[PDB]
């Protein structure tokens, strides 16, 4: 395809040595999933990692 740009959020600031950090960006993970329990800053990052972890399992 081609896709476009991202939203207009700035919730990806530095993160102290202990807090969660985005697994796709690299700043902070204010949000955390349940199944994967990963860390993300926005909602797009969440699915961006989930749909990426599924293909990694292969099959099905």
Binding site for Zn ion (CB under 5 A): 22, 25, 41, 45
**Residue 51 falls in which region: left (phi positive, over 0), alpha (psi -120 to 50) or beta:** alpha
Residue 28: how many other CB atoms lie within 10 Å: 19
Which CB sits closer to Zn ion, 6 or 60? Answer: 6
CB of 2 to Zn ion, least distance (A): 21
Which CB sits closer to Zn ion, 44 or 54? Answer: 44
Which CB sits closer to Zn ion, 4 or 60? Answer: 4
């Amino acid at each position: 395809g081609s896709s476009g740009s991202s939203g207009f959020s700035k919730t990806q600031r530095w993160a102290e040595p202990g807090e969660p950090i985005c697994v796709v960006c690299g700043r902070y993970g204010e949000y955390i999933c349940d199944k994967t329990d990963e860390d993300v800053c926005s909602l797009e990052c969440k699915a961006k990692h989930l749909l990426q972890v599924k293909e990694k399992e292969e099959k099905s």
